[PDB]
């Protein structure tokens, strides 16, 4: 569109931007090459979010080509070393979209990014971590090419005093460990124990919970389903239309967690959040001293604010995991819920009530306040699942 194209580009660069990007992608679906490259260069030079949007959308829609990959690789390699937050995450998304394009240059580009990430292992460390996460999720085959340098550099870079590095690198370790288990463990456990022996608390807890959770998917399945929250006999139309190491170390994992949860009860919110997330899975793997250590932190956090959601989620997982011994704290849990509801966050409280059902006739008396709270999709789905199961 030349002039109109440049105008729309400037407008998008200066909700509305998202709509403009979507329209541009839809137009690229139907649809010169030099003009498109020049427009991309103008938006790139000018703001950065619009440039990355245009580059990624045009690449993904129009399809990867040798000239396009060669011209846009320089733009990406210029964006990566220095940029601003949020824009970096968008750039990493664009890198992932280019990675999953499925071209001959994809292997070279992925190896180049992985090697530079390893060399790096703060707009650089976080960028490398995000790229590693995306490549692990998208291309396990080329992500498994470098595993020993992966572990060796990450086990040193993670324990640096940073938060975003921890958040991303733990997820990268999640993907790597999942791939390894589907297809190292001793080195991971040794490094985690050395680090554990307030920054060096939640990282070790996460690393141990990785082995515990991968060994036992039952605890993770409930969390995944709650986070998300025809017939064979039909006659087809007569006219067809056109168409081991994680089990033997899990004990030590739970052991080094029952003490950390008791120690860092209120040290340096983030640590409490991670502990609340990780305790129920460990108890689900192996439930009284561990149970008491988990109960203290969970019950303490439930009463407090800014952690009620995750604390109740952990409480529900604990109720599912421990059936008989958990009944002692039922009056405390019910009283806290009956205190929290009248103020109306409570959607997750309803979900945890559903998981607790996942029973007694007292639920008939408990029906009235939940209904009196009000309408919510979580409440409706919880009631429907309750009627299904019981």
From Swiss-Prot:
<feature type="repeat" description="HEAT 5">
    <location>
        <begin position="140"/>
        <end position="180"/>
    </location>
</feature>
<feature type="repeat" description="HEAT 10">
    <location>
        <begin position="288"/>
        <end position="323"/>
    </location>
</feature>
<protein>
    <recommendedName>
        <fullName>Serine/threonine-protein kinase mTOR</fullName>
    </recommendedName>
</protein>
<feature type="repeat" description="HEAT 1">
    <location>
        <begin position="1"/>
        <end position="31"/>
    </location>
</feature>
<feature type="repeat" description="HEAT 2">
    <location>
        <begin position="32"/>
        <end position="64"/>
    </location>
</feature>
<feature type="repeat" description="HEAT 11">
    <location>
        <begin position="324"/>
        <end position="358"/>
    </location>
</feature>
<feature type="repeat" description="HEAT 12">
    <location>
        <begin position="359"/>
        <end position="390"/>
    </location>
</feature>
<comment type="function">
    <text>Serine/threonine protein kinase which is a central regulator of cellular metabolism, growth and survival in response to hormones, growth factors, nutrients, energy and stress signals. MTOR directly or indirectly regulates the phosphorylation of at least 800 proteins. Functions as part of 2 structurally and functionally distinct signaling complexes mTORC1 and mTORC2 (mTOR complex 1 and 2).</text>
</comment>
<feature type="repeat" description="HEAT 3">
    <location>
        <begin position="65"/>
        <end position="102"/>
    </location>
</feature>
<comment type="similarity">
    <text>Belongs to the PI3/PI4-kinase family.</text>
</comment>
<feature type="repeat" description="HEAT 7">
    <location>
        <begin position="217"/>
        <end position="239"/>
    </location>
</feature>
<comment type="subunit">
    <text>Part of the mechanistic target of rapamycin complex 1 (mTORC1) which contains MTOR, MLST8 and RPTOR. The mTORC1 complex is a 1 Md obligate dimer of two stoichiometric heterotetramers with overall dimensions of 290 A x 210 A x 135 A. It has a rhomboid shape and a central cavity, the dimeric interfaces are formed by interlocking interactions between the two MTOR and the two RPTOR subunits.</text>
</comment>
<feature type="repeat" description="HEAT 6">
    <location>
        <begin position="182"/>
        <end position="216"/>
    </location>
</feature>
<feature type="repeat" description="HEAT 9">
    <location>
        <begin position="253"/>
        <end position="287"/>
    </location>
</feature>
<feature type="repeat" description="HEAT 4">
    <location>
        <begin position="103"/>
        <end position="139"/>
    </location>
</feature>
């Amino acid at each position: 569109s030349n002039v109109s194209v440049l105008q729309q580009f400037a407008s998008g660069l200066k909700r509305a931007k998202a709509a403009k990007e979507l329209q541009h992608y839809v137009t690229m679906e139907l649809r010169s090459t030099r003009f498109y490259d020049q427009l991309n260069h103008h938006i790139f030079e000018l703001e950065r979010k619009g440039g990355i949007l245009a580059i990624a959308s045009l690449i993904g829609v129009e399809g990867g080509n040798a000239t396009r990959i060669g011209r846009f690789a320089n733009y990406l390699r210029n964006l990566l070393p220095s940029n601003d937050p949020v824009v970096m995450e968008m750039a990493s998304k664009a890198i992932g979209r280019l990675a999953m394009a499925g071209d001959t240059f994809t292997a070279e580009y992925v190896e180049f990014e992985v090697k530079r990430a390893l060399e790096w292992l703060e707009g650089r460390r976080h960028a490398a971590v995000l790229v590693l996460r995306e490549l692990a999720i998208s291309v396990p085959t080329f992500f498994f090419q470098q595993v020993q340098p992966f572990f060796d550099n990450i086990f040193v870079a993670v324990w640096d005093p940073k938060q975003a590095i921890r958040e991303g690198a733990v997820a990268a370790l999640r993907a790597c460990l999942i791939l390894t288990t589907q297809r190292w463990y001793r080195h991971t456990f040794e490094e985690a124990e050395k680090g554990f022996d307030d920054d060096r608390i939640h990282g070790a807890l996460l690393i141990l919970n990785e082995l515990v959770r991968i060994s036992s998917m039952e605890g993770e399945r409930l969390r995944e389903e709650m986070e998300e929250i025809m017939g064979f006999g039909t006659k087809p139309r007569h006219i067809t239309p056109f168409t081991l190491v994680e089990s033997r170390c899990c004990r030590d994992l739970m052991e080094e967690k029952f003490d950390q949860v008791c120690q860092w009860v209120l040290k340096c919110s983030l640590i409490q959040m991670t502990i609340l997330n990780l305790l129920p899975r460990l108890a689900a793997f192996r439930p009284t001293q561990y149970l008491q250590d988990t109960m203290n932190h969970v019950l303490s956090c439930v009463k407090k604010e800014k952690e009620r959601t995750a604390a109740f989620q952990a409480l529900g997982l604990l109720s599912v995991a421990v059936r008989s011994e958990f009944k002692v704290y039922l009056p405390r849990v019910l009283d806290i819920i009956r205190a929290a509801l009248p103020p109306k966050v409570d959607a997750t409280v309803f979900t945890c009530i559903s998981m607790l059902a996942r029973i007694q006739q007292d639920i008939k008396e408990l029906l009235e306040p939940m209904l009196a709270v009000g309408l919510s999709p979580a409440l409706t789905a919880v009631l429907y699942d309750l009627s299904r199961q019981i």
